[PDB]
Design a protein around this nucleic acid. Structure first.
Lengths: 185, 141, 57, 193, 61
RNA sequence: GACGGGGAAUCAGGGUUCGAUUCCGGAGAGGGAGCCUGAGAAACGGCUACCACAUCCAAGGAAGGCAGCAGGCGCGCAAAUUACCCACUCCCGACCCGGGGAGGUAGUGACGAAAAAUAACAAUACAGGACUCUUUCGAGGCCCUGUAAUUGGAAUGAGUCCACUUUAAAUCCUUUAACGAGGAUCCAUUGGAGGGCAAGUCUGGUGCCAGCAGCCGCGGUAAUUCCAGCUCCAAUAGCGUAUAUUAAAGUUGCUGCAGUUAAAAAGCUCGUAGUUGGAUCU
């Protein structure tokens, strides 16, 4: 009798077929194009899309003009709009079954920083996110798998402690200066 | 089904019970004779004592001789034949040694060309045989 | 021959060689993208059986 | 109490964590029953009882090293394997013979030096009480010349289950509290054999 | 950039000495606690439980 | 190889298996039996007698129940510190004030779950596509795109550590000084490369021997399978093996199987239970 939780669920899912050409082809294509680490995060993005698709199928199973159907139909559509992946004009319940993995991966923090033009490459963007340089509305984020909301898209900039956004120079810069006045004097 | 009536269910249930009891894997898994006759006693691994080293002949298309170990079990007390897994491993073991033994992976059946052998050697003298093969660990003295 | 049933024969009498230079890693960002663009851009699909990436023939 | 001791054993030195320092009362010897006092700090030149958990294999008459550092890799025990290798006196020739059990290590040493002069080989060197494993390792020698398939016990209490199952497959028991009646019983058993 | 915490303002020193946890007053140095462990207290309690009479205070040392 | 249930795994639908296990209820403190007190006990950190086990002894007699918290032995393939505190949540007492291995904290911990390092950025060592020509080689080639240990930087993290913070007191996390990376040796393994099933008719050795192989089958002195080096693919701080189980099993078929010849309808008939019962009433 302890005060614990014991509440945990799996986020990714393992596919049924272990070896196949084409599945590996677009999985490697998505990993290479979006700068992902390995297949676990694309499997968990597939699992989140599977959850949303199952909820949409269950909600469309129920008949029209039921208050529960309208209730979490409006809730799910409002959540998908607030993420920003869904367009405002596509305000319909059966449009949930018409988007794919790259739409969810478009709202990643890594590719949002890469499209903002303050980073050179996608892997350079992932390193720059990973190494505590970008704040999200006066709050630094060091992880790449961050879902940027639509309201927070226009408030992404460098950290004030980072040397890129204005601050103290880095460790190798002062070491280079110390070597410079060591060799000069 | 065939007997299709609304106010009958125990006939279907009793027929399904008898037809499920008249099976092979269900009859093996739900009787005490199969667990009693099992040398492992329902365990994945077991420990035993090495007492003999012998060599059995293989099948007809595959012509070789396999090195296998006679082992007497600790929990039960009856002799089995166990097969050392990898090349150059009979010299790693000697008589009167404790050993860890496990099945091949056919749920208690012979695998390949080796007759009468359904178990294989995993660990001997509380050290892994794979580390003895690959040289990661040195054998106890 | 010595005998038929002496264990570790081909393991014992085989020759011994050493290792080579250390390889690098990019955690599959170009480690598998290199074989992807080898199979896509470099190697053309020839009408036949197959054409593998490790085919040293 | 926050120190790691290393004690040499049969298969080289082993790592032992201290559990407690049982200091016997000064007016009694160390052959006394369970009447001791726990002590936090011990004085110099004292005989106390030291208990560990995973010992199972020790030899008396050897120095032990106390390390103030933190063990991460067995590199400080090389000199220890040198003193446990130099001047080998009680070499454990692990052959296939009689299986012997004793309460103390000195009794086991006395029995093995009796057996090497009695030119009957020995198999196991387990100490303490007798168990199912001891009786069964004695009884697995009923194959391949079963003359050396008997238990030797000097002043060890016998568990009732092992003595009950010994008669099931026919393994006779040597149990005695003194040495020369045990030696004469072994001689009489061999001559009857 | 931002750190949060919980504080309180009393009215006088006597109210702060009246209704406060002892450990925080010890952190301010206004209270001292006994430097006895639970163990030796437990064998002390068992040793006074062993004997009956006035000698309970004598055996407690 | 059964404590029950709330539940867990798998899952199109329909189902199969497990539930000792933190919540609720029931039973017992070696197994039977009996009892005092108390409102409430057949109580066992209460007592009495039996047998089994078992402690001390001057031998006349005394003292026992860890299926509580730690720890030891046995057993087994199989499971952790003889640690600190009543501060947080409650409980008991004559009661702010005392106590609580109930509990909380720390260590062990790759049962399992979540996030997430091992690198980014140029000029040249060079192969070509993108817009226009030289019938064809050549050129502008600025976004180039990719690979090999030439060059100096943009760097931050593990760890070493001052402090601060947390805390009954520390440790864990976060913040912050001074350190801290060029083959950034501050070095990522685990299984495989004939088919299923991603991935070399590469090199050298023994040549139905050694062995590999879940299944087909490879081994006979040309081995696309053995034994070692090079390259390559799979998942990645994780991977392989053995057991019990689920889906695949429309190979237990209620949805939803078969019965001439592949396993299969009693030799035939009567007959009591059970199963199914014509039309017609606004």
């Amino acid at each position: 009798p302890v005060a614990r939780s014991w509440v945990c669920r799996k986020t990714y899912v393992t596919p049924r077929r272990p070896f196949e050409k084409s599945r590996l082809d677009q999985e490697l294509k998505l990993i290479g194009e979006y700068g992902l680490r390995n297949k676990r995060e694309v499997w968990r993005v597939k699992f989140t899309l599977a959850k949303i698709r199952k909820a949409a199928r269950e909600l469309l199973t129920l008949d029209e003009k039921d208050p529960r159907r309208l209730f979490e139909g409006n809730a799910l559509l409002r959540r998908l709009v607030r993420i920003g992946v869904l367009d405002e004009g596509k305000m319909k319940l059966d449009y949930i079954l018409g988007l794919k993995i790259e739409d969810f991966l478009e709202r990643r923090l890594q590719t949002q920083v890469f499209k903002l033009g303050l980073a050179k490459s996608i892997h350079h963007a992932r390193v720059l996110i990973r190494q505590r340089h970008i704040r999200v509305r006066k709050q630094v984020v060091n992880i790449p798998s961050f879902i940027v909301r639509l309201d927070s898209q226009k408030h992404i900039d460098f950290s004030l402690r980072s040397p890129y956004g204005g601050g103290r120079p880095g460790r190798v810069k002062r070491k280079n200066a110390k070597k410079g006045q060591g060799g000069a004097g | 089904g065939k007997c299709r009536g609304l106010r009958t269910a125990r006939k279907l249930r009793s027929h399904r019970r008898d037809q499920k009891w008249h099976d092979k894997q269900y009859k093996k898994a739900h009787l005490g004779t199969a667990l009693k006759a099992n040398p492992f006693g329902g365990a994945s691994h077991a420990k035993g004592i090495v007492l003999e080293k012998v060599g059995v002949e293989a099948k007809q298309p595959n012509s070789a001789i396999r090195k296998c170990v006679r082992v007497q079990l600790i929990k039960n007390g009856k002799k089995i034949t166990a097969f050392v897994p990898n090349d150059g491993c009979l010299n790693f073991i000697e008589e009167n040694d404790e050993v860890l033994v496990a099945g091949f992976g056919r749920k208690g059946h012979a695998v390949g060309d080796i007759p009468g052998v359904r178990f294989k050697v995993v660990k001997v003298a509380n050290v892994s045989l794979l580390a003895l093969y690959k040289g990661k660990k040195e054998r106890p003295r | 021959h010595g005998s038929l049933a002496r264990v570790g024969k081909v393991r014992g009498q085989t020759l011994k060689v050493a290792k080579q230079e250390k390889k690098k890693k990019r955690t599959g960002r170009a480690k598998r993208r290199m074989q992807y663009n080898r199979r896509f851009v470099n190697v053309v699909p020839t009408f036949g059986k197959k054409k593998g990436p490790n085919a040293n023939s | 109490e926050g120190d790691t001791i290393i004690v040499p054993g049969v298969e080289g030195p082993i790592v032992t964590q201290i559990r407690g320092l049982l200091l016997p009362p000064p007016m009694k010897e160390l052959r006394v029953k369970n009447q001791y006092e726990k002590h936090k700090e011990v004085e110099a030149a004292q005989g106390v009882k030291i208990l560990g958990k995973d010992l199972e294999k020790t030899l008396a008459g050897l120095p032990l090293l106390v390390a103030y550092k933190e063990d991460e890799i067995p590199v400080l025990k090389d000199e220890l394997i040198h003193e446990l290798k130099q001047t080998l006196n009680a070499i454990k020739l692990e052959e296939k013979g009689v299986y012997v059990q004793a309460s103390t290590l000195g009794s086991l040493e006395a029995l093995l030096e009796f057996l090497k002069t009695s030119e009957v080989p020995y198999a196991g060197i387990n100490i303490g009480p007798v168990h199912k494993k001891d009786v069964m390792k004695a009884s697995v020698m009923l194959e391949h010349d079963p003359q050396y398939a008997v238990i030797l016990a000097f002043d060890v209490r016998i568990e009732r289950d092992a003595q009950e199952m010994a008669d099931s497959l026919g393994v006779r028991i040597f149990s005695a509290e003194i040495i020369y009646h045990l030696f004469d019983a072994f001689t009489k058993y061999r001559q009857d054999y | 950039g931002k750190t949060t915490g919980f504080g309180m303002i009393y009215d006088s020193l006597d109210y702060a000495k009246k209704n406060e946890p002892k450990h925080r007053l010890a952190r301010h140095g206004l209270y001292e606690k006994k430097k006895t462990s639970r163990k030796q207290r437990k064998e002390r309690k068992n040793r006074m439980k062993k004997v009956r009479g006035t000698a309970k205070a004598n055996v407690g040392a």
